[PDB]
From Swiss-Prot, chain A:
It comes from Aequorea victoria (Water jellyfish). SUPFAM superfamilies: GFP-like. Changing Y142H: In mut1.3; shifts fluorescence lifetime from 3.03 to 2.78 ns. In mut1.5; shifts fluorescence lifetime from 3.03 to 2.72 ns. In mut1.27; shifts fluorescence lifetime from 3.03 to 2.85 ns. Contains a chromophore consisting of modified amino acid residues. Maturation of the chromophore requires nothing other than molecular oxygen. Changing Q66H: In P4; leads to no detectable fluorescence. In mut2.2; shifts fluorescence lifetime from 3.03 to 1.94 ns. In mut3.3; shifts fluorescence lifetime from 3.03 to 1.88 ns. Changing S30R: In mut1.28; shifts fluorescence lifetime from 3.03 to 2.76 ns. In mut2.2; shifts fluorescence lifetime from 3.03 to 1.94 ns. In mut3.3; shifts fluorescence lifetime from 3.03 to 1.88 ns. Keywords: Chromophore, Luminescence, Photoprotein. Green fluorescent protein has been engineered to produce a vast number of variously colored mutants, fusion proteins, and biosensors. Further generation of mutants led to more stable proteins (at 37 degrees Celsius for example) with brighter fluorescence and longer fluorescence lifetimes. Changing D152V: In EBFP2.0; shifts the excitation and emission spectra to shorter wavelengths and increases quantum yields compared to BFP. Changing Y142C: In mut1.9; shifts fluorescence lifetime from 3.03 to 2.74 ns. This is Green fluorescent protein. Gene3D superfamilies: Green fluorescent protein (2.40.155.10). Changing E219G: Suppresses the 399 nm excitation peak, leaving only the longer wavelength peak at 475 nm.
Length: 228, 99
């Protein structure tokens, strides 16, 4: 358990800000919503503020706050994300789309007042102009995944490896290979975890009254993989 | 893929679809400027599925009877979640016989 954990015992407002650049196409996204870590529950709405999003919304779901995961009581000593709070952590990823381009992301996740903020810069290169991504061939939905977490003692943080499965309209599934590293922003002690995983499930939807390009996200994340 | 027509209610969601149809039709101009009044029964929708073995929901299609400027129109609207903008006015014809 940690002092950081005490900041998540109720409903927490969330802001998400992303600046992106994919094959030179520049875009910005703002998101708002809230998280309730007691139930591993996230509710977020994202709006593309620069017009039409040049990549499919599902490809950005993992980039758009694992501190809202529900860690079962017997596992709470393994919750790095909340222990890094309020000072926060940096989350870096490489995301490799099978036989297409890749995203590189850097995010800072921290409290600003009572708000959990995720500020992201994203760089995408080597995408095929009529591939699944720039050609918008992904179904608008999202699969359930298990994300394995392990300690990275030398960076006083964690790392994760996982594959995201994106449904493709023609019936195939395209894998997005995620390599992730998280390191605390502050200098204080953090909880470093034994090996475990996060079990995720996400539902994507639309706001019928919204005229801008957007995504509504409902997500549940639960930690598992450690016996009690 | 696409399922069968099902009756839906004429609540706010449906009335807003009506409003959308009239606003879109107003952009073309083959009729004079229309003023939305109401969607009347029956309204119906069919589910649209991705064309593959998963067959998950891609969106919906709507067929509405819409009163605008005191005339009854048939409006067909498609909703496609994969591509922005999602709502498109497919057809808008009138006046038509009352259902």
């Amino acid at each position: 358990g940690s002092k950081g954990e005490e900041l998540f015992t109720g409903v927490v407002p969330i802001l998400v800000e992303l600046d992106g650049d994919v094959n030179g196409h520049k875009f910005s996204v703002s998101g708002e919503g809230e998280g309730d870590a007691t139930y591993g529950k996230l509710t977020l709405k994202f709006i593309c503020t620069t017009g039409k999003l040049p990549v499919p919304w599902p490809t950005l779901v993992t980039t758009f706050v694992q501190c809202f995961s529900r860690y079962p009581d017997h596992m709470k000593r393994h919750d790095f994300f909340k222990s890094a709070m309020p000072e926060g952590y940096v989350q870096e990823r490489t995301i490799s789309f099978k036989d297409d381009g890749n995203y590189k992301t850097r995010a800072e996740v921290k409290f600003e007042g009572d708000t959990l903020v995720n500020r992201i810069e994203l760089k995408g290169i080597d995408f095929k102009e009529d591939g699944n991504i720039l050609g918008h061939k992904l179904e608008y939905n999202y699969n359930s995944h298990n994300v394995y977490i392990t300690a990275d003692k030398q960076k006083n943080g964690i790392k994760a490896n996982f594959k995201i499965r994106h449904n493709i309209e023609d019936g195939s599934v395209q894998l997005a290979d995620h390599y992730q590293q998280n390191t605390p922003i502050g200098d204080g002690p953090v909880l470093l975890p034994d090996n475990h995983y996060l079990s995720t499930q996400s539902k994507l939807s639309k706001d019928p009254n919204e005229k801008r390009d957007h995504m509504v996200l409902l997500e549940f994340v639960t930690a598992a993989g450690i016996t009690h | 893929g696409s399922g069968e027509w099902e009756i839906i209610d004429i609540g706010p969601f449906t009335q807003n679809l009506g409003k959308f149809a009239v606003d879109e039709e107003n952009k073309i101009g083959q009729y004079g400027r229309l003023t939305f009044n109401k969607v009347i029964r029956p309204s119906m929708k069919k589910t649209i599925y991705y064309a593959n073995s998963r067959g998950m929901i891609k969106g919906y299609e709507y067929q509405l009877y819409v009163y605008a400027s005191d005339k009854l129109f048939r409006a067909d609207i498609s909703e496609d979640y994969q591509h922005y903008p999602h709502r498109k006015l497919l057809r808008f014809n009138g006046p038509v016989p009352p259902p």
